[PDB]
């Protein structure tokens, strides 16, 4: 249930924000910020998503005027953990 | 912790399996196979994913020449529970 309960909760959480039906059944990349702001892993500011994140606020408002899917809430929850090769800095 | 522990074990699972290092330091999708056959939902054969997951494995083996990434790994298992739109079949 390992992998169960992340894919579970990746859904979930996101039917729990406001914009699950009201947006566009969807949110915009700019609601997702403040989801990233505590359901990511807490805070996480001190190893080095710090550089990523605020890079994140920037793209996450400009390109995410359509819209943020799952997929994209997975790219950018993993992006600021990683955003530097792969598995390098964690495996 | 809700989607920390959803992020956490999608990275964690992947540590797990044996191609962490020895493949691409990332798994061949066809790796991912076995990945989704346990840890996915435990099964999933009976709501609609069956179609998504045989689609999968064609595109898995087919696609998955060069590696899977822990992007795809979102992907696929996402894919398998939603393919037709988003959430339409869930929320």
Redesign the interface.
């Known amino acids: 249930?390992?992998?169960?309960?992340?894919?579970?909760?990746?859904?979930?959480?996101?039917?729990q924000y406001s914009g699950?039906?009201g947006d566009k059944?969807?949110l915009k990349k700019s609601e997702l910020k403040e989801?990233i702001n505590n359901?990511?892993?807490?805070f996480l500011e001190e190893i080095k998503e710090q550089e990523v994140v605020d890079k994140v606020m920037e793209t996450l408002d400009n390109d995410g005027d359509g819209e943020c899917?799952?997929?994209e809430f997975?790219?950018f929850?993993?992006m600021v953990?990683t955003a530097c090769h792969?598995?390098?800095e964690?495996?």
């Open positions: 249930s390992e992998l169960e309960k992340a894919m579970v909760a990746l859904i979930d959480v996101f039917h699950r039906e059944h969807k989801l359901e990511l892993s807490h899917d799952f997929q997975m790219a929850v993993a953990t792969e598995f390098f964690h495996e």
